[PDB]
Amino acid sequence: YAQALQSVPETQVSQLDNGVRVASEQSSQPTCTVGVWIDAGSRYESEKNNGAGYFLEHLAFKGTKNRPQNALEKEVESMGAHLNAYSSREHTAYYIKALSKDVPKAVELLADIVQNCSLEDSQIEKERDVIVRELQENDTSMREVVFNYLHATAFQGTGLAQSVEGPSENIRKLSRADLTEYLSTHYTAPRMVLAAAGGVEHQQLLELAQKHFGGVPFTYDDDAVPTLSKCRFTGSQIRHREDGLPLAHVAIAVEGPGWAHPDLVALQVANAIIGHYDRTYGGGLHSSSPLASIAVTNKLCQSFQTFSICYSETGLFGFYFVCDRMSIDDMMFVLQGQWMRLCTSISESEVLRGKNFLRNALVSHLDGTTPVCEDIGRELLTYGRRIPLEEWEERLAEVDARMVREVCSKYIYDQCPAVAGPGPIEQLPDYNRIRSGMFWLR
Template sequence: MTTRISTLSNGLQVVTDQIDTVETAAVGLWVNAGARHETAEVAGVSHFLEHMAFKGTANRSARDIAESIESVGGYLNAYTSRENTCYYARLLSHDVPLAVDLLSDILQFSTFKEEELEKERQVILQEIGESLDNPDDLVFDHLQQTAFPAQALGASILGTPDSVTQMTRPHLKTYQEQHYSASRMVLAATGKVHHDAIVAMAEERFQHLPRHTPIKTEKARFEGGYHQLHRPLEQVHFMMGFEGLPLGHPRYYSLSVLAALLGGGMSSRLFQEVREKKGLAYSIYSFTSAFSDSGLLGFYVGTSEQHFAPALETMTQELKKVSDTLTIKEICRVKAQLKASLMIALESTTTRCEQLAQQMITYGRPLSPSEIIDRIEAVELDDIKDLGQSLFASPPAISTVGPVFQMPTYDEVCQMLGQTIPQHNAASA
């Protein structure tokens, strides 16, 4: 792999990773603009804008866009996260110029025709409705809202039915003009690609991007609290999150090891205790969400109402004792697991492309696989002990969806963790 970086005359960064052993390529444009950068009035505008990018430009109709990429056997898609929006293509390496051309077209010359906007509005409203019917989506969204209340970072990426219903073409245009500037973008390409050729194409194709000073974002404030949503379901869906670490934090990989040790796979402590030994749940896992200035370390369990209390008790006991019972052997196993997962993931040009772009946004440079492995290897037992003690002593955010009539109170959960929390945010629905 040969990684190179260039900055265009307008400030757009281009990063490539040339892999000559493959015949394909992944090309994507990452915009540092997501749900976190929205106001309440236009909640969901980042996601709406992403949808509209494929609905026609000054040069191509929506059908032309689809046929252009599919006629060469390629794939074009996009997604929105809390801090970024990505537009990307996967295709054969000799068709990379088409990918750059399509991305530049939809990012600079989308027309946002009213009739297309109205159709896509209905699609997004259906997407919101589907999410509201999905307890897995609900419990996670409410956890995020509870962790970061009254902040754009805690709001739904999809927006609300009201905000999407009231979204207008001027809202989309204004948001795009304010946030889709060259200095907030990274063009990444991996696979059988040639850096100089992509830079030359990008210099020509992306010359119409606006140039703005980056807009400052409100600093994240993790607060925690308790949100309960009653639904007549078969299972209780429970999530508990603690303030994690931002991307780029020196202890980020220590947190990754801790999360994997507790709930990352069948050999993890929570899986072994809750599912394998006691049969209390089918699904139990940990996860991390990392943002530019904060993060979440979360845990999920889904189980029947009658098994929920012992499952929660087992979960909290495992969190309480983890710092006192860690072993070198256990940490070595988890490190090996993380390193292998990294290398397996990098077999995908799309994954490598996404990783490069995220690293450019976070660190200002790409990290080589060997550098990431070194950072994982550098994690020591005492690092994880200290991290576990500090994280699990802080007030959590809790979200529950399902038959919640017999749920413990927030204070009771905190007491299970060995905490005393005199005040908290609580909400029920």
């Protein structure tokens, strides 16, 4: 095992005279996946700019000036390659998966997109109504509105509070211009990363990129990367009620440290302890995760998930459960009790497993090419370089009990949480109560 890790090939990295960082992991696999990952999200938008990046995503594929829609689509389909992508609050990306016999072709396709989207005044107007619709579909997914609302209130009044898709007004009116304005402002080499994994050999990649990414920086701005305005967390709640729904959704959380910070490992290990449930499990005997056990014994919920979603300089460490109108309270009671237990009286027997369960994730985090690429893409972009499983190992292979406590309690104990809840939530006690559910009557 340790050897298996030790024998895992290093991930080549190198920046251009441009600013783009080109990294990759050579394997053998006849297939592979390459793509660019941008240092851009909704976080970077304005009150009037917000949604661009997304409006933009829906056009990124519909063709370039160098080769219109009918073609781009035809050329990719024709080579059996897959082009897909996404955009969060601080992180966007476009990736392709082909037979590593096409690094050069893929690489070119990529560039041609992150640099020359047609932005056909005629296509735009179409996607405009496609989103407004797609948006009204994202809506009934109470599992997502809830998180949005969480962020909303959690980081109320700041860039983070804005949802990645954006208001209908913005989408109804963004101009062919604004989109261009968003592209030419954030899609710059210094903030972008060209990553890959497969049978591809670094050099052929570099050159190929160094060839199609012919960007040139004049001034110093171009060459530099602007740091964002800090986001203020706020212990608060938001309740979107409607007994009209089948069941309720709840999400509570404290502020997170941020990528850079190490503790995100100990903290990542703690969540592995409370883990997650889901009525399709087979386990009233689930190892620890009493929250799950209890959830089963007393029928506390349909499911729940522990999460340490983080950003550049902040984040959200919390949990979210889906439950029936009548078991909302106990569930919250029992869970919120686990955080305390977590940081007030944890045990080695627990952390031991915690670790293992993580390591197994940590590894399956890299199952395939597309996913690996995702790490290189991210890692660089958010951490600075790449963290080898061999490393993550140690980092989280030396977390003892006392370590979990010290930290969890450092981030959870007597902190003013941020809760959000849509659906039939009459039974969810007031803030004050969930608040004083943040300190154990030790």
